[PDB]
Amino acid sequence: VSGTVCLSALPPEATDTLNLIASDGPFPYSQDGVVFQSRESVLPTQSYGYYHEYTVITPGARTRGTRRIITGEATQEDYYTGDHYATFSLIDQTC
């Protein structure tokens, strides 16, 4: 994991995605909520089903883009990637 980032430093759309995760949706895309298979990633190794992925919208794009939040099972364990799962930072919702 790349480091920790304060939510206030991320695009505003990442706040919108965390607020949909807190309400259980409804989500804009059917790929929001699917299990993320962390097998090739830099996230900590976990068994199938521990991580799930959600879209952070990129304003103006004609596709889902490359920004996502991955959740883990622990309290406030959420990671942001802006480059389609190449690098991740742990989000700190308190700053």
In the chain, the domains with their CATH numbers are 1-95 (3.10.450.30)
| Cβ-based neighbour number of residue 27 at 10 Å | 15
User: Which residue reads 């622990």 in tokens?
Assistant: 74
> Is 53 annotated as catalytic?
yes
Phi (first) and psi of residue 93, to 5 degrees: -75, 0
From 52, 73, 77, 84, active-site residue? 84
Q: Collapse the DSSP code of 72 into the 3-class scheme (helix H, G, I; strand E, B; otherwise coil) and give the result.
A: coil
CA distance 21 to 55: 10
Which three-class secondary structure state does DSSP give residue 52?
Answer: strand
Half-sphere exposure of 59 (CA within 13 A, CB side): 5
- Catalytic residue among 40, 53, 73, 77, which? 53
Owner of token pair 């930072």: 89
Q: Solving technique for this entry?
A: X-ray
- The half-sphere exposure of 34 on its side-chain side, counting CA atoms within 13 A, is 10
Question: Quick one: which of 19, 10, 4, 20 has its CA closest to 77?
Answer: 4
> Which two tokens mark 88?
């991740």
Whose tokens are 């919208």? That residue is 57
Q: Is 52 a residue of the active site? A: no
